[model samples]
Target: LHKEPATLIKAIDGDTVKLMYKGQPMTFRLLLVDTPETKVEKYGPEASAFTKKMQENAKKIEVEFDKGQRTDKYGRGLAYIYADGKMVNEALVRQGLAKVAYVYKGNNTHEQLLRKAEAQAKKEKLNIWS
Candidate 1:
């Protein structure tokens, strides 16, 4: 939505978000990576906290659509999310908050980049993996 002062309304874990855009409800999948299931790592509350910090009341949101599309069993449109012009998905993995997942190959433009970020985080022994 090309509006001002956009805000995050709900969080579906640390990697998914919902926002009100153009007076319609929209759900988004953060691109580049996936956070560990909250059931692990003591629920890694820090991951949620970091996401909240990044998107809380954020209005200047940007989004990119991938070439390949897949429907989850629940029938939600999965897409890549960006904010402030940064790749939120990559950022999460780079910070050791998530893991790079590349099951969908056709639309995976950032797979290599995400791999790099994830590798870096792994090498550095960041987060719970440490």
Candidate 2:
């Protein structure tokens, strides 16, 4: 549960984002979720729009790291992002704009909630699942 405050610089598609974290601007790939795309196949635009809307107007934003390794091989920071006290990662999964995936960290502490949201989204057949 090591969460840090960040300033949203931009939303780089649905799954990736740019932020000013720890006094440096960096790109962080949201953990346990993969959105369609901004760069579009199916529900790509919708996914990107959802993410942009969530962070763009937020007064407070936070990035939470999981239990295991930090960044990916691509040098992207893996984090669970929050906006205005709400977990945007979970919201994306729940909305079916993003899928629960990249679950490399087994005991990351947020796997349960993320998967649960995916279940709900799959049941409702929203966006990506649609």
Candidate 3:
């Protein structure tokens, strides 16, 4: 796995963001988490809002690539994002804003961590889980 520094260009949704990678613009889908779609899902707005707010408030953001695959079938970068020392992917699940949705063949580094966070969120009935 290789890690790179990135800057947030836009918060596309609860689980997606545009970033400046190597001086070029790139879209990355947060690995291991899927948030509600703003187009048709319940609580989608709130989830997106939460992510936007988090991005706005964070002091720094960085992206880390998975060892398994660099991009999804659609070509969006599959990455773990960090904001101000917090794992944004895990935070989404821990806060009940998203779920562990996709597990790639070899990118399982945060799978267990995300699963635990989702379980805790479900148990506490937070946000989307509520």
Instruction: Report the lDDT tens digits of candidate 2 across residue range 20-101.
Output: 9999999988888877755567878988888889999899999998887878888888888999999988998899988888
> Alpha-carbon error at 89 in model 1, in Å?
0.2
Model 3, residue 9: displacement in angstroms? 0.8
Worst 10 residues of 1 by lDDT: 1-10
Candidate 2 regions off by >4 Å?
Answer: 105-107
Estimate TM-scores for all models.
0.80, 0.93, 0.94
- The weakest ten consecutive residues by lDDT in model 2 span 100-109
Q: Rate the local accuracy (lDDT) of all candidates.
A: 0.68, 0.86, 0.88
TM-score of 1: 0.80
Steric collisions counted per model: 1, 0, 0
Residue-level lDDT tens digits of model 1 in 26-74: 7766655667666655436777777777776455665565666733445
lDDT (Cα, 0-100) at 34 in candidate 3? 84
Looking at model 3, which ten-residue stretch has the lowest summed lDDT?
1-10
Model 3: per-residue Cα lDDT over 1-130, one tens digit each? 5567888999999988999999999999899888999976987988899889888788888898888888988879989998887888998999999989868858888899999999999999998899
